[PDB]
Structure 1
Amino acid sequence: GWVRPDLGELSKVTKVKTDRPLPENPYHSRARPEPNPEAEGDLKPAKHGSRLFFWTM
């Protein structure tokens, strides 16, 4: 009583019910290095300006 599958049927993406636990680190990755501190705040004018040689602004 076997019925041949039709066109476009064997290329379907199906779903599988398995009891095998999902691997948590299949890539065996190490710990990622922590990012840079990411400073944030309100901008204030530069103290005494550019401070380049004799320029007062």
Structure 2
Amino acid sequence: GWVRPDLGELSKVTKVKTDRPLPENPYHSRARPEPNPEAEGDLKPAKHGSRLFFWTM
């Protein structure tokens, strides 16, 4: 009672039921370094301007 598969049936993406737990770190990755924290707060004008040599603005 065997039926030959039709054209395009063996190439389907199927689903499988398994009791094997999904691995959590299959790449054996290290802990990622922490990023530079952030930019926060409101922007205020530069204190005393550019402060470049004699310029007061």
Paired residues, number: 57
Question: For the aligned residues, what is the CA RMSD?
Answer: 0.5
User: Distance between the aligned counterparts of 2:43 and 2:2, measured in 1?
Assistant: 76
Gap regions ≥5 residues in structure 1 = none
User: Distance between the aligned counterparts of 2:55 and 2:18, measured in 1?
Assistant: 74
TM superposition score normalised by structure 2:
0.97
Offset at residue 39 of structure 1 (A): 1.9
Identical-residue share of aligned pairs (%) = 100
Deviations 1:15-55 (A, max 9, x none): 00001111000000000000101121100000000000000
User: Distance between the aligned counterparts of 1:37 and 1:54, measured in 2?
Assistant: 35
